[PDB]
Design a protein around this ligand. Structure first.
Ligand SMILES: [Ca+2]
Ligand SMILES: [Ca+2]
Ligand SMILES: [Cl-]
Ligand SMILES: [Cl-]
Ligand code: NA
Ligand code: NA
Lengths: 227, 227
């Protein structure tokens, strides 16, 4: 990810809302999926100011570079080789850390000695059980955070797993991502571009309307992107 | 540093007291300098329990691998490539972070592109002004935290700065160190050994009574080191 662009994202338990992490700040967006009533609810503002529990930690100093909602008001956040499980309390505004900060390889042992050990580019919550897809360069992992294991017991290339990404900028990786409130729809970001994808746990599907520009799709981000 | 051995140390504002950092825990010690009557004041205890402002940080998780006092009830602490200025508030147990957690080359930018950038081995407070000696492998630096600069133009080898360490387990580095309450005496740790040294911001040091065993010098730490 380059300066100013979306480096992390996750879906809120609050309907039709998502947190986007850029540099060392965040934006809370009502990304209005399936309509055009998008609006920025909060931000741009420092992670250290927004989520005070993160203020005097690595996440509050440097921001957050990968994430994904788990369940309820919880989400895993990453910065380089460290990660944390947080409660981002969207109603009470009373964020707390639940786990860590801990090295990725240690919260997720199966990642030790892989490309994810030193860091993760992007991730999103599967609709399926406790499954998660994570991306590092052109590689991706599918995990189960309840069993804390790799579902596909093998780390495979993105094109092997996302044919819709072949001959696109996403074939080689993503800046950030997040699962929509819209069942089985996923957003992938990369530079000033986004891909709205429809997935299905049976390997093969589609990009909806090709690769477009983030600010064309969400005019409310017009001069927030790049930051 | 091998597991169970002293990984960091700094001198307390309270007379003849010091904090020794071992694994993910620490000991508070009346180390009794120039006299005897050593006594363990607290611990061993997880850093995350004794210092709660650090509980949910990389320090609470992994411990401290390098440190040095500055002035008052403050100190710089380290863990790999991250550091933080803390208030250990010895009178009240109400430690708080004052700065960081943050990358070393970030707080001390002259360490950028240096052997110090990825981590520091040991450090001690100079009696002179706001100077500090830091060691990594077999070399060391002399910085000033007031001007936040390097006093010594160049990173020098240990044997060059410390003749007394020639042909000693210390010329290849140390695990930990701290300045004594007793003027210009410094303690250096390596495995089960230690050198009590008489420095003098200059050229000619001397190891008082040779290299000895930590537990023979501090009988109180005898069922504790190694941990
Ligand atoms: Ca990223
Ligand atoms: Ca050390
Ligand atoms: Cl993400
Ligand atoms: Cl030290
Ligand atoms: Na997601
Ligand atoms: Na010291």
């Amino acid at each position: 990810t380059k300066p100013g662009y979306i480096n992390a994202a996750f879906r809120s338990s609050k309907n039709n809302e998502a947190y986007f992490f850029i540099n060392d700040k965040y934006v809370l967006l009502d990304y209005a999926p399936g309509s055009s009533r998008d609006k920025v609810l909060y931000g741009p503002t420092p992670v250290r100011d927004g989520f005070k529990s993160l203020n005097q930690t690595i996440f509050g100093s440097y921001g957050i570079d990968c994430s994904f909602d788990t369940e309820n008001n919880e989400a895993f956040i990453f910065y380089e080789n460290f990660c944390a499980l947080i409660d981002y309390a969207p109603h009470s505004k009373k964020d707390k850390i639940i786990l860590g900060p801990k090295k990725i390889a240690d919260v997720f042992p199966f990642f030790e000695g892989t490309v994810f050990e030193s860091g993760i580019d992007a991730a999103y919550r599967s609709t399926r059980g406790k499954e998660v897809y994570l991306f590092k360069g052109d590689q991706y992992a599918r995990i189960d955070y309840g069993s804390n294991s790799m579902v596909n017991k093998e780390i495979k290339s993105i094109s092997s797993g996302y044919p819709c990404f072949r001959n696109t900028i996403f074939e080689s990786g993503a800046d950030a991502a997040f699962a929509s409130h819209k069942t089985n729809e996923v957003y992938f970001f990369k530079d000033d571009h986004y891909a709205r994808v429809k997935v299905t746990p049976x390997x093969k599907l589609x990009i909806m309307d090709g690769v477009r520009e983030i600010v064309d799709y969400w005019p409310s981000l017009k001069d927030i992107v790049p930051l």
